[PDB]
Design a protein around this nucleic acid. Structure first.
Lengths: 121, 35, 65, 459
RNA sequence: CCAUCUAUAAUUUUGAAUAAAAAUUUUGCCGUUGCUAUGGC
């Protein structure tokens, strides 16, 4: 019913933020709504993490539309302050994208969170 | 060159303004004004 | 700088001594000579250098310890 | 007048002072060595008067004041000489502050009634950027990136700073002149926290490359690197013993390092809202541990980004006591900003009730050594003072100090007066932004300055 | 770095007095609010 949906719980959010941080160190993370949008167009995204406290929320609502057309899982986290900190940058982040790489060192972790997001949807 | 930077800056803000309008049932002008 | 640590210290009055394992950290150095280790151990334990004995030093692979 | 006779004179003259000040004498002499036994011996929580504390805020020009370190001379019982560097500095208290503006400043805090008084400062800039671009050649005298930390040597002879330029510059206290630069010699070795071993020249530096470095300031040399953390070592604390404790942020682990034994103890929170809610029949999962302070050689406390203040014991790997949402919940986002809808009810639905609410982070956490009182900080707008139970199995909120407005980057406490009657001054650096980054939204009314609160004991 | 020596500042003698002279020892910027404290960037 709310525009930002599904919203991950406290337990799920930490695991998402964990994977985001590891992907950042491995250069497997695309930060920002614009960069996330490009990944969806290129079909190189594992899943999209969005911040549900974006002010206004509408400036990232095109991503769910692109995700559902492309069958890419997506999930909302409560805070953009927390998402930006996990992303590794010094500024809040409203959207981020995990880049597809079957030869990554964090493959198992990504698919674990990817499955739970799919269950959430 | 300075003219191009304003054009790029305005294009980014125009993109966000379109998002607020499209994905809002009853869009307001409050955010466009501050933008 | 060089660090010297003693561990597994046993007081042995049967042989009238203290026995211990000496770990030496020597970053950016090949190793520490037995004479210099004896000097520093003598200062640390407040004993004559002639009463200090050190042996069996093996450097860790990769150096530094 | 042999050296033995000189000690006897000072020791005799020391005893005469105790007799003048005053069973009582014998107890006091034990208290002189209570520090050597790593147990809490300063039970003054109930005697503190938080309500009557004289609070003041001192503004500073520097933008985003990042850390504060205080120096208090202490009488050395073994030689009966004050730790002051020289005769001029007898009984003079100093505080050193650093900021993201690349400025190091020293203040005088000796007079509790008066505000901190600036004495000297040193500022960096682009002139100090190294031309070499090689890590071992990063030996420029000044800083050229954000300064994150500062620590004052216990002997009063040096003050050491570090930051995002991957250097460890040690300055002379009197003139703030750099005397040595010690590069971390790592690509990502940014210094995030500094802690001096109490009454010693040994310095512990936590770095963003997931390692802890130990230095000897008197010898101006690096000694050892400690490994084991899986993420950035955000904070570090030390006491008289060599047992420094550290927190690794996102890996959510607190580690205690036994430097002589070359062993480490790992502590992990392991709390889950599902069990917390069921036992109750808003709980937030832990994201990272950001702050740590050593109450004791066998106890320490940590603060996390979910607002949990945890008490730890070396015996137990799990926390012995936890204080959830210590500093409260963040204000709910405005409904006028969440969405662009004209209808108010539509905007309210985007708030999703209380699901978007998040707790305050514990940005600062300081415990007076070997005591039962510690102080926590955040950007809530107040400093909360807590008291630990006598059995050291719990703690309660002693009081609050609401003068502080802004992000509490670092907290320090200094005491003065006779042994029985002591006044405690709490100095906290306040900033408009978090020390590590600019994530936190601008807090209404926040200012850059040094918060001060003088607290008295009566009873 | 410490000490010493200077410098700065305060009490005192001739002095209406200036004067000499021994002698000694809260902010980067912009406001509001007091005679001090907190609002914006």
């Amino acid at each position: 019913n709310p525009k930002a949906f599904p919203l991950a719980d406290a337990a799920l959010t930490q695991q998402i933020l964990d994977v985001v941080q590891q992907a950042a160190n491995l250069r497997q993370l695309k930060k920002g709504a614009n960069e996330a949008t490009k990944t969806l167009n290129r079909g190189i995204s594992e899943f999209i993490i969005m911040a549900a406290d974006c002010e206004p929320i509408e400036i990232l609502l095109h991503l769910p539309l692109l995700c559902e057309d492309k069958n890419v899982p997506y999930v909302f986290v409560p805070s953009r302050v927390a998402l930006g900190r996990a992303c590794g940058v010094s500024r809040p982040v409203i959207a981020a994208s995990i880049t597809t790489n079957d030869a990554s060192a964090i493959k198992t972790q990504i698919y674990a969170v990817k499955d739970k997001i799919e269950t959430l949807l | 060159k300075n003219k191009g930077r304003i054009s790029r800056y305005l294009a980014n803000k125009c993109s966000m303004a379109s998002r607020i309008d499209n994905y809002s049932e009853e869009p307001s002008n409050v955010f466009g004004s501050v933008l | 700088a060089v660090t010297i640590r003693t561990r597994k210290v046993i007081s042995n009055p049967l042989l009238a001594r203290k026995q211990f394992v000496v770990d030496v950290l020597h970053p950016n150095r090949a190793n520490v000579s037995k004479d210099e280790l004896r000097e520093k151990l003598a200062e640390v334990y407040k004993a004559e250098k002639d009463a200090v004995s050190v042996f069996g030093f093996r450097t860790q692979f990769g150096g530094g310890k | 007048e042999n050296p033995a006779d000189k000690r006897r004179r000072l020791a005799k003259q020391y005893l005469e002072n105790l007799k003048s000040e005053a069973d009582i004498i014998a107890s006091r002499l034990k208290e002189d060595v209570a520090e050597q036994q790593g147990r809490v011996f300063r039970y003054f929580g109930d005697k503190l008067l938080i309500s009557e504390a004289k609070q003041s805020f001192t503004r500073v020009g520097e933008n985003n004041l990042t850390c504060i370190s205080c120096f208090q001379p202490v009488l050395n019982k073994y030689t009966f000489e004050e730790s002051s560097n020289g005769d001029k500095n007898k009984g003079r208290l100093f505080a050193y502050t650093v900021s993201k503006d690349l400025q190091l400043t020293k203040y005088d805090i000796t007079d509790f009634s008066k505000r901190p008084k600036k004495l000297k400062y040193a500022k960096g800039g682009a002139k100090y950027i190294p031309t070499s671009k090689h890590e071992y050649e990063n030996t420029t005298e000044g800083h050229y990136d954000e300064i994150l930390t500062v620590a004052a040597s216990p002997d009063g002879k040096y003050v050491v700073t570090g930051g995002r330029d991957r250097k460890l510059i040690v300055w002379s206290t009197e003139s703030l002149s750099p005397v040595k630069v010690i590069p971390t010699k790592d690509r990502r070795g940014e210094v995030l926290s500094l802690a001096f071993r109490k009454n010693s020249d040994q310095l512990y530096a936590s770095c963003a490359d997931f390692k802890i470095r130990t230095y000897s300031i008197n010898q101006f040399s690096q000694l050892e690197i400690l490994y084991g953390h899986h993420d950035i070592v955000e904070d570090i604390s030390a006491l008289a013993m060599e047992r420094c404790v550290t927190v690794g942020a996102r890996d959510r682990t607190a580690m205690l390092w036994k430097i002589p034994d070359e062993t480490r103890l790992t502590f992990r929170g392991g709390d889950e809202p599902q069990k917390l809610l069921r036992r109750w029949m808003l709980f937030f999962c832990e994201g990272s541990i950001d702050v740590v302070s050593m109450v004791d050689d066998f106890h320490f406390i940590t603060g996390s980004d979910n607002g949990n203040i945890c008490l730890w014991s070396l015996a137990k790997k799990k926390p012995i006591f936890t204080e959830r949402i210590a500093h409260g919940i963040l204000p709910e986002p405005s409904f006028n900003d969440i969405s662009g809808e004209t209808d108010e009810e539509l905007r309210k639905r985007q708030l999703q009730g209380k699901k978007l609410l998040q707790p305050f982070w514990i940005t600062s956490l300081y415990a007076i050594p070997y005591s039962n009182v510690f102080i926590s900080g955040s950007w809530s707008g107040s400093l909360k003072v807590w008291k630990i139970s006598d059995n050291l199995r719990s703690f309660e909120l002693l009081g609050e100090l609401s003068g502080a407005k802004g992000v509490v980057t670092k907290i320090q406490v200094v005491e003065s007066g006779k042994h029985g009657k002591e006044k405690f001054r709490i100095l906290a650096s306040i900033a408009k932004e978090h020390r590590l980054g600019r994530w936190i939204a601008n807090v209404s009314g926040a200012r850059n300055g040094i918060y001060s609160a003088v607290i008295d004991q009566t009873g």
